[PDB]
What does this fold into?
Amino acid sequence: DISVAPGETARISCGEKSLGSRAVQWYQHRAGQAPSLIIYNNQDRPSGIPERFSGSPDSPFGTTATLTITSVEAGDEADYYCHIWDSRVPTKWVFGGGTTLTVLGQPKAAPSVTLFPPSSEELQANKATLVCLISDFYPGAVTVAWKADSSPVKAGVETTTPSKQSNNKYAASSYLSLTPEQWKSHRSYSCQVTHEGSTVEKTVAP
Amino acid sequence: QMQLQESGPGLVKPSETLSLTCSVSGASISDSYWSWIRRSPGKGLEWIGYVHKSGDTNYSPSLKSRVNLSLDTSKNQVSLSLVAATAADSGKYYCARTLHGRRIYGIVAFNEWFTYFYMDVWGNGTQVTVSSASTKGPSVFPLAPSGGTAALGCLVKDYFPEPVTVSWNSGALTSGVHTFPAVLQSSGLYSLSSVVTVPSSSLGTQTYICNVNHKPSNTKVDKRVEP
Ligand SMILES: *[C@@H]1O[C@H](CO[C@@H]2O[C@@H](C)[C@@H](O)[C@@H](O)[C@@H]2O)[C@@H](O[C@@H]2O[C@H](CO)[C@@H](O[C@@H]3O[C@H](CO[C@H]4O[C@H](CO)[C@@H](O)[C@H](O)[C@@H]4O[C@@H]4O[C@H](CO)[C@@H](O)[C@H](O)[C@H]4NC(C)=O)[C@@H](O)[C@H](O[C@H]4O[C@H](CO)[C@@H](O)[C@H](O)[C@@H]4O[C@@H]4O[C@H](CO)[C@@H](O[C@@H]5O[C@H](CO[C@]6(C(=O)O)C[C@H](O)[C@@H](NC(C)=O)[C@H]([C@H](O)[C@H](O)CO)O6)[C@H](O)[C@H](O)[C@H]5O)[C@H](O)[C@H]4NC(C)=O)[C@@H]3O)[C@H](O)[C@H]2NC(C)=O)[C@H](O)[C@H]1NC(C)=O
It folds into this structure.
């Protein structure tokens, strides 16, 4: 994940080192929007895509697919995936990469974060839930990451799409479904809210 | 330009067949290859497979045993069928028009070339949650809270369907009340939190009770919350 000031150039590498001849495609995915094709056949550009976006050549062997975006602008703030085709590697059925590009020159409002531990009432019911409430942020795009102690957690995480508040800022909530055992065993859990390149963290301990 | 839209007939219970449709407008399905893609929370953006009129059709190794992609020329629709759906098949599904080219890096007669596929037109994608969720009332839990302000709330957990209503002290407390939109969980049930911001000094004086109402199951719960 990278953050770039408007006007500067962004560099995103994706995939493993190349073995044979390649045809790399690059895809752009903005939050809650259909993905787009930005690059195909390594360097070729579909209609509409500006020459600011450029891809890496499939030479020499051993190169890593790199997408370069010069003179960055707000619109280029999105997730960037690559789909690699290599004459010596088996066809890929999962897209690679996923790097998020944040552009820094934008008007914004940092999120407020409140994290609740599981309630003693829920625990007696042999269930546990961490509640991370996110409010008052703008634009309406956040990414939430959970930490059991120091290690990231993927399982059990449920996060809502950002919703517009009455004051035209955004709200969102992330839930971590957890067993009471997992809750007690770990020293602590953290909710990490990233917004326009800056992350806000809250931690609770059993 | 061309437009694509992914949709389901509706709700998928475990061990039922997931049936998705990709309606194509501004172009005929017979002029292009077509692909389905999905993003499962457990994994990343994965290519399900592609289909074509010529019979040029292949599926992902991990899904080949359960998936069927078909072309409906009459309805100009691209179809996806996934037998024995489970929570593992939950996520967002994309339909996309697929193009192809040939990477020629040697003599064509020496088989020194390969065909590559790329997606230039994607749909918004549709969300698929596989569950046996049915009418169910919510469980209500207190979210307990020196100086400064404090956030106390109520966790309205595991109900279906939407919606639920939440007030505080029967409407006597509306200041600093923020009810968040519910999350749809992998269980197919919903959960939301209602938090009210208050002065710490007030924690002793005032009494706090959230009033939760869920019509579909005729549930009414009054949960007192304290520190
Ligand atoms: C895929 O997807 C896509 C997309 O998506 C999107 O995006 C993404 C990215 C994400 O984000 C997501 O989320 C989103 O969604 C899609 O597409 C889409 O779709 C959608 C649907 O929903 C839509 O939406 C919309 O939006 C809008 C906006 O727009 C804009 O923006 C956007 C973004 O945000 C975009 O997208 C678009 O495009 C746009 O953009 C733009 O563009 C242009 C051109 O290009 C440019 O130029 C510009 O710049 C741009 N911009 C920007 C970018 O920024 C919005 O607005 C909307 O909203 C609305 O609506 C809704 C529903 O839908 C609601 O909810 C809301 O609320 C609104 O509403 C409204 O409101 C208002 C206020 O209130 C109002 O007004 C008022 O009015 C009154 C009156 O009223 C009345 C009475 O009277 O009472 C009523 C009644 O009812 C009536 N009646 C009748 C009969 O009618 C009446 C009458 O009218 C008579 O007249 C009487 O009067 O009225 C008064 O007047 C007052 O005063 C006022 O104030 C109104 O009313 C309302 N309205 C209504 C209608 O309701 C919406 O949200 C969008 O747009 C789209 N997009 C596109 C691109 O297209 C798709 O779909 C998919 N695909 C597929 C295939 O599927």
Q: What stands out?
A: The pocket of ligand 1 is lined by residues A 32-33; B 3, 5, 124 (CB under 6 Å). The first helix of chain A runs from residue 120 to 124. The domain at 106-206 of chain A is CATH 2.60.40.10 (Immunoglobulin-like). Chain A touches chain B through 47 residues (CB under 8 Å).
